């Protein structure tokens, strides 16, 4: 990865990609996000990540 | 008046029936999978001051 002052930043789209097969794994520290709920991304759609 | 006297119970999952009671102050876990895929963690404590 890059550093701190100078990350990169890639475009994503046109994608089909499961949420839950992430949030099961336990190679995370934590996994807590601001709104958004980790169970119901399986079910949304977005225009753009 | 107390400083943190005064709370409020976050929970979600459940839609409850309106105007009835609730006494049980219990920490939310769950024990199974859909806690950080182990048992006994994701165990915060519902009410915020």
Known sequence: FASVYAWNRKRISNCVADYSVLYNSASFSTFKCYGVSPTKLNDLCFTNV | ???????????????????????????????????????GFNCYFPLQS
Request: hydrophobic content about 25%; proline content about 5%; glycine content about 10%.
């Open chain 2, 1 to 39: 008046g107390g400083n943190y006297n005064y709370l409020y119970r976050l929970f979600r999952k459940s839609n409850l029936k309106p105007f009835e009671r609730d006494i049980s102050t219990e920490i939310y876990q769950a024990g199974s999978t859909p806690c950080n895929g182990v048992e």
